[PDB]
Write an enzyme that holds these catalytic residues in place. Structure first.
Site, PDB file in Angstrom:
ATOM      1  N   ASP B 125       0.908   7.327  13.109  1.00  0.00           N
ATOM      2  CA  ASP B 125       1.904   6.539  13.815  1.00  0.00           C
ATOM      3  C   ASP B 125       1.819   5.261  11.862  1.00  0.00           C
ATOM      4  O   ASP B 125       0.269   4.845  11.349  1.00  0.00           O
ATOM      5  CB  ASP B 125       1.234   5.548  14.442  1.00  0.00           C
ATOM      6  CG  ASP B 125       1.631   4.094  14.656  1.00  0.00           C
ATOM      7  OD1 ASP B 125       2.440   3.865  13.663  1.00  0.00           O
ATOM      8  OD2 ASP B 125       1.188   3.556  15.174  1.00  0.00           O
TER       9      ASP B 125
HETATM   10  N1  LIG Z   1       0.093   6.900   9.200  1.00  0.00           N
HETATM   11  C1  LIG Z   1      -1.068   7.287   8.968  1.00  0.00           C
HETATM   12  O1  LIG Z   1      -1.178   7.077  10.757  1.00  0.00           O
HETATM   13  C2  LIG Z   1      -2.461   6.561   8.753  1.00  0.00           C
HETATM   14  C3  LIG Z   1      -1.950   6.306   7.324  1.00  0.00           C
HETATM   15  N2  LIG Z   1      -3.176   6.224   6.568  1.00  0.00           N
HETATM   16  C4  LIG Z   1      -3.143   5.842   5.345  1.00  0.00           C
HETATM   17  O2  LIG Z   1      -3.945   6.521   4.852  1.00  0.00           O
HETATM   18  C5  LIG Z   1      -4.494   6.158   3.305  1.00  0.00           C
HETATM   19  C6  LIG Z   1      -5.794   6.208   3.615  1.00  0.00           C
HETATM   20  O3  LIG Z   1      -6.857   5.887   3.879  1.00  0.00           O
HETATM   21  P1  LIG Z   1      -8.317   6.174   4.613  1.00  0.00           P
HETATM   22  O4  LIG Z   1      -8.495   7.289   4.361  1.00  0.00           O
HETATM   23  O5  LIG Z   1      -8.232   5.366   6.245  1.00  0.00           O
HETATM   24  O6  LIG Z   1      -8.275   4.796   3.847  1.00  0.00           O
HETATM   25  P2  LIG Z   1     -10.081   4.534   3.226  1.00  0.00           P
HETATM   26  O7  LIG Z   1     -10.768   3.156   3.168  1.00  0.00           O
HETATM   27  O8  LIG Z   1     -11.193   5.469   3.803  1.00  0.00           O
HETATM   28  O9  LIG Z   1      -9.780   5.660   1.520  1.00  0.00           O
HETATM   29  C7  LIG Z   1      -9.538   4.799   0.416  1.00  0.00           C
HETATM   30  C8  LIG Z   1      -9.321   5.620  -0.201  1.00  0.00           C
HETATM   31  O10 LIG Z   1      -8.952   5.196  -1.783  1.00  0.00           O
HETATM   32  C9  LIG Z   1      -9.054   5.312  -2.899  1.00  0.00           C
HETATM   33  N3  LIG Z   1      -9.436   4.209  -4.046  1.00  0.00           N
HETATM   34  C10 LIG Z   1      -9.009   2.417  -4.181  1.00  0.00           C
HETATM   35  N4  LIG Z   1      -8.469   1.990  -5.138  1.00  0.00           N
HETATM   36  C11 LIG Z   1      -8.556   2.826  -5.970  1.00  0.00           C
HETATM   37  C12 LIG Z   1      -8.051   3.297  -7.556  1.00  0.00           C
HETATM   38  N5  LIG Z   1      -8.023   2.110  -8.304  1.00  0.00           N
HETATM   39  N6  LIG Z   1      -7.987   4.557  -8.009  1.00  0.00           N
HETATM   40  C13 LIG Z   1      -8.305   5.474  -6.922  1.00  0.00           C
HETATM   41  N7  LIG Z   1      -8.285   5.859  -5.637  1.00  0.00           N
HETATM   42  C14 LIG Z   1      -8.539   4.454  -5.104  1.00  0.00           C
HETATM   43  C15 LIG Z   1     -10.940   5.105  -2.616  1.00  0.00           C
HETATM   44  O11 LIG Z   1     -11.248   5.249  -3.363  1.00  0.00           O
HETATM   45  P3  LIG Z   1     -12.519   4.815  -4.340  1.00  0.00           P
HETATM   46  O12 LIG Z   1     -13.678   5.535  -4.423  1.00  0.00           O
HETATM   47  O13 LIG Z   1     -13.009   4.103  -5.852  1.00  0.00           O
HETATM   48  O14 LIG Z   1     -13.457   3.063  -4.182  1.00  0.00           O
HETATM   49  C16 LIG Z   1     -10.919   5.640  -1.284  1.00  0.00           C
HETATM   50  O15 LIG Z   1     -12.174   6.956  -1.405  1.00  0.00           O
HETATM   51  C17 LIG Z   1      -3.939   4.385   3.056  1.00  0.00           C
HETATM   52  O16 LIG Z   1      -3.069   4.067   2.505  1.00  0.00           O
HETATM   53  C18 LIG Z   1      -3.357   4.490   4.829  1.00  0.00           C
HETATM   54  O17 LIG Z   1      -2.885   3.240   4.868  1.00  0.00           O
HETATM   55  C19 LIG Z   1      -4.701   5.697   7.278  1.00  0.00           C
HETATM   56  C20 LIG Z   1      -4.838   6.244   8.662  1.00  0.00           C
HETATM   57  C21 LIG Z   1      -3.650   6.730   9.066  1.00  0.00           C
HETATM   58  N1  LIG Z   2      -1.240   2.041  15.431  1.00  0.00           N
HETATM   59  C1  LIG Z   2      -2.591   2.225  16.015  1.00  0.00           C
HETATM   60  C2  LIG Z   2      -2.958   3.604  14.537  1.00  0.00           C
HETATM   61  C3  LIG Z   2      -3.777   3.493  13.626  1.00  0.00           C
HETATM   62  C4  LIG Z   2      -2.407   4.140  12.833  1.00  0.00           C
HETATM   63  C5  LIG Z   2      -2.555   3.477  11.435  1.00  0.00           C
HETATM   64  N2  LIG Z   2      -1.709   3.504   9.597  1.00  0.00           N
HETATM   65  C6  LIG Z   2      -1.666   2.570   8.947  1.00  0.00           C
HETATM   66  C7  LIG Z   2      -0.601   3.020   8.212  1.00  0.00           C
HETATM   67  C8  LIG Z   2      -0.689   1.330   6.763  1.00  0.00           C
HETATM   68  C9  LIG Z   2       0.122   2.494   5.676  1.00  0.00           C
HETATM   69  O1  LIG Z   2      -0.508   3.117   4.051  1.00  0.00           O
HETATM   70  O2  LIG Z   2       1.749   2.076   5.586  1.00  0.00           O
HETATM   71  C10 LIG Z   2      -0.801   0.606   9.729  1.00  0.00           C
HETATM   72  O3  LIG Z   2      -1.375  -0.093   9.294  1.00  0.00           O
HETATM   73  O4  LIG Z   2      -0.587   1.013  11.220  1.00  0.00           O
HETATM   74  C11 LIG Z   2      -4.006   1.272  14.823  1.00  0.00           C
HETATM   75  O5  LIG Z   2      -3.168   0.102  14.911  1.00  0.00           O
HETATM   76  O6  LIG Z   2      -4.913   1.499  15.588  1.00  0.00           O
END
Ligand SMILES: NC(=O)C1=CN([C@@H]2O[C@H](COP(=O)(O)OP(=O)(O)OC[C@H]3O[C@@H](n4cnc5c(N)ncnc54)[C@H](OP(=O)(O)O)[C@@H]3O)[C@@H](O)[C@H]2O)C=CC1
Ligand SMILES: N[C@@H](CCCCN[C@@H](CCC(=O)O)C(=O)O)C(=O)O
Ligand SMILES: NC(=O)C1=CN([C@@H]2O[C@H](COP(=O)(O)OP(=O)(O)OC[C@H]3O[C@@H](n4cnc5c(N)ncnc54)[C@H](OP(=O)(O)O)[C@@H]3O)[C@@H](O)[C@H]2O)C=CC1
Ligand SMILES: N[C@@H](CCCCN[C@@H](CCC(=O)O)C(=O)O)C(=O)O
Lengths: 449, 449
Positions: B125
């Site tokens: 989502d």
């Molecule tokens: N559509 C959905 O339902 C969902 C979407 N997401 C999206 O997925 C993406 C990743 O989420 P999630 O895995 O939980 O994130 P985390 O916060 O667990 O991890 C983020 C990662 O990005 C890296 N990072 C941060 N800054 C940099 C940089 N400058 N250069 C390189 N790497 C960097 C980190 O690096 P470092 O090792 O250097 O600290 C770390 O490995 C997000 O954009 C999140 O919003 C997440 C959950 C659900």
């Molecule tokens: N809406 C639910 C599911 C989480 C999904 C997280 N997705 C991120 C996507 C952000 C992005 O990378 O654009 C969000 O903030 O909804 C909840 O809040 O528990």
């Protein structure tokens, strides 16, 4: 010396008991009125023998009891006194997972004279709850602490993801037993004084009961808790309550059924005939017609609803049960049992679904140094999915403690004679140790404040 | 032709994506700033290579991107525009599980001219929710039906049995991402008209949201839903809302943090020094002393509480976080991030615990024949217990869809160029098919009324 046990019953909580006993090399005769049910439970199980036996037949019961070392009464608790009388004349031991009722306690001396042990209240609730309530209470007392408040709530319910029906409830143990428990008057201690709740008004006492953020539990008092002031040796407690947990919306639904007469066990001539539910309901609720509009009109005029939203929900729930339909009833003489037959039809766990057992003790403690703290003892377990072949949480938490108690009575670990319950560390500790170490069954403590 | 993929990020949702791609024989370079983190994720994973890379370094980013066929941006969404600009220069494809923001959309034509596909919003989502929301809407329309109401609620939360902390919340995805989402202004359609909710007042809109009897969910609007009237092609809808689910009590707790300034990302000089939380909180809340009494005094006068009970609860939760203690803060310049460092410390899933993903679409439909009905599309999944080595529900439902999308962009299944999202059956069907048949991922439909 090979031991032999007569297991009366082949219902919901029996498989784990049969498994644990036969896995110990103990022979088990599985007996109930329907031979097929007994066969189905023991099919493929080593050391088990299925037979048809009606505990109402004194001669038949005595003859079978005499062939074993002990009898487990896993049948409606109304039969326990009869089973005990048979065990007394045959000089055999007894185990049940039921409350020690006055009828049973009366047989205490006779049991002692016969040199037999009648171990009761060793299932989940009553059973495990006693074990961990006493464990903490004795610990606190040994530390010079005071139990100012004792709470113990338990609920055998469907897992949240499997609770999707109008009642948020599915059967994991005795269906009629569930209905009977819904009518029990309750009594408990609040602010140092006895508070009573009449059976017919039990559901109205239901209040949200917080345990963990994710669950939507509501609770109401369970039977008479006042005797526990003496039973658990906590005279210093101002609050003492043993309660039951259900999911949001359940009690209001039950309340309506109670108010319109569906939980009456009074024999009605018209309930011995397989008439359409429409007609049965009309007579029970006393509507002027079998019409849905007329029936509902009468129900609303005789029932209470928190809001029009609630009313719409409950009425739709009743319709879901089919009591306004043309479908014929399963004639059982009285409203409670007749309704129960239909509930058994519609509220069974289905493929892939699982139950959930939530048990939590809460203690408001006043430490020796005048300090104060809050302690909780919790057990939260999900059953194995239907179709997996595993135990539901209810069958496991009831049948395993039962089997362990049986093994303890057989090997002398539990040796006091008479009518007993898990009220002494002498037998409670061994029970807890075995359940924890061998089966992973236990309540986990934690200081909340 | 062996395919190669640059996976930016090694956090929460990456392992499933890495597993799926490498199990497909696709080479994957795991890159993020902390080399050890990239190494830990890829340790023992065939076809994977860990490296340190900071996307802020244009030269380093272009050089690495150029060595692969596609880049996955599983990093904070503030970086997506930068990543896409690099992909455009190198003519490489991109996949993210993030929302297509205005900044990203500005690059659509440049992406098309470079002949690359930038596939977004294909996680849980946004992601799975889009797939099944559109599936049902197109089915209904094809049947001459009308979507009068469209609701989509989703929550990634700890399982109820694992939700036992003051917030009823534990991290399963980006910690600061969670906090950022708590400040998003919302807008939606209610009774045919646009209704707006200011970011700072989001938590106050939270209302109990019923799905199943066992769960205690509360919900609030998630971002701007109004564009979906056109995006999902439901101009006939009077109500259109995409929302988020949390557990009872969560929003009230967050509301307080927002009101006292803990979710501000304004750089504060005093928040760059490892000072005691007492002091940090004092400055942030603007109390006349680092005293627990003075701080709480200031907070109660600047925050809102539904009751004295609620006030007691939230204050105890704040103390649990340790913002009133002597423990030194992890200096991060601003209140939001500084607090976040402590939340990450106290709100992690522990051994044996698991998360839960609840996603449910609700459609009020007006059939072709004037008839009416209510349909729900649900997905309710628990994650593997911590320590089992399995995926959490969040990681699985975000990482697997991402990997499937990556494979589809690589083999041409998704071939449209520019900045995309799962908004066409052309690519939504193949995505749903693979997810359902190969991974068992799907939303199950059901007529509720
Ligand atoms: N559509 C959905 O339902 C969902 C979407 N997401 C999206 O997925 C993406 C990743 O989420 P999630 O895995 O939980 O994130 P985390 O916060 O667990 O991890 C983020 C990662 O990005 C890296 N990072 C941060 N800054 C940099 C940089 N400058 N250069 C390189 N790497 C960097 C980190 O690096 P470092 O090792 O250097 O600290 C770390 O490995 C997000 O954009 C999140 O919003 C997440 C959950 C659900
Ligand atoms: N809406 C639910 C599911 C989480 C999904 C997280 N997705 C991120 C996507 C952000 C992005 O990378 O654009 C969000 O903030 O909804 C909840 O809040 O528990
Ligand atoms: N302490 C605790 O936490 C719990 C205790 N219990 C107690 O356990 C006991 C059994 O529960 P449960 O397994 O769910 O029950 P069920 O209702 O599923 O099964 C009851 C069984 O008893 C049998 N039975 C009924 N009448 C007779 C009779 N006249 N002669 C012989 N057998 C008879 C049935 O026989 P038939 O096949 O002929 O119909 C059936 O096999 C009850 O007393 C219940 O209250 C249950 C759950 C929890
Ligand atoms: N109180 C809970 C736990 C169920 C325990 C069922 N035990 C039976 C025992 C009856 C007996 O055999 O004496 C009960 O009715 O409490 C709930 O109702 O969900």
């Amino acid at each position: 010396a090979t031991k032999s046990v007569l297991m009366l019953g082949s219902g919901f909580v029996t498989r784990p008991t049969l498994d644990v006993l036969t896995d110990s090399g103990i022979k088990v005769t599985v007996a109930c009125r329907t031979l097929e049910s007994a066969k189905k439970l023991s099919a493929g199980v080593q050391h088990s023998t299925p037979i048809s036996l009606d505990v109402n037949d004194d001669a038949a019961l005595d003859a079978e009891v005499a062939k074993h070392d002990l009898v487990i009464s896993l049948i409606p608790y109304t039969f326990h006194a009869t089973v005990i009388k048979s065990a007394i004349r045959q000089k055999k031991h007894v185990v049940t997972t039921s409350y020690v009722s006055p009828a049973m306690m009366e047989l205490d001396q006779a049991a002692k004279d016969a040199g037999i042990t009648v171990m009761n209240e060793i299932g989940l609730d009553p059973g495990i709850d006693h074990l961990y309530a006493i464990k903490t209470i004795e610990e606190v007392h040994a530390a010079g602490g005071k139990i100012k408040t004792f709470l113990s709530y338990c609920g055998g319910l469907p897992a949240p993801e499997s609770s999707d029906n109008p009642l948020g409830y599915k059967f994991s143990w005795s269906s009629r037993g569930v209905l009977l428990a819904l009518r029990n008057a309750a009594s408990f201690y609040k602010d140092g004084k006895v508070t009573n709740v009449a059976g017919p008004e039990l559901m109205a006492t239901a209040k949200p009961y917080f345990i963990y953020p994710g669950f939507a539990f509501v609770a109401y008092p369970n039977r008479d808790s006042t005797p526990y002031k003496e039973r658990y040796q906590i005279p210093e407690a101002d609050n003492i309550v043993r309660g039951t947990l259900r999911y949001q919306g359940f009690p209001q639904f039950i309340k309506v059924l109670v108010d319109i007469g569906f939980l009456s066990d009074e024999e009605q001539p018209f309930l011995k005939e397989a008439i359409p539910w429409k007609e049965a309901t009309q007579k029970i609720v006393k509507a002027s017609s079998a019409s849905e509009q007329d029936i509902v009109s009468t129900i609303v005029s005789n029932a209470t609803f928190e809001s029009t939203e609630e009313q719409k929900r409950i009425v739709a729930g009743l319709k879901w049960l089919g009591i306004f339909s043309d479908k014929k009833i399963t004639p059982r003489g009285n409203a409670l049992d007749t309704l129960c037959a239909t509930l058994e039809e519609k509220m069974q766990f289905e493929e892939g679904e699982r139950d959930l057992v939530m048990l939590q003790h809460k203690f408001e403690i006043e430490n020796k140094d005048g300090s104060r703290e809050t302690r909780t003892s919790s057990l939260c377990e999900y059953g194995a999915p239907i179709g997996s072949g595993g135990y539901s949480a209810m069958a496991k938490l009831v049948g395993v403690p039962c089997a362990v108690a049986v093994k303890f009575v057989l090997d002398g670990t539990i040796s006091d004679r008479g009518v007993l319950a898990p009220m002494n560390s002498k037998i409670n500790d061994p029970l807890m140790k075995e359940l924890k170490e061998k089966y992973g069954i236990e309540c986990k403590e934690k200081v909340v404040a």
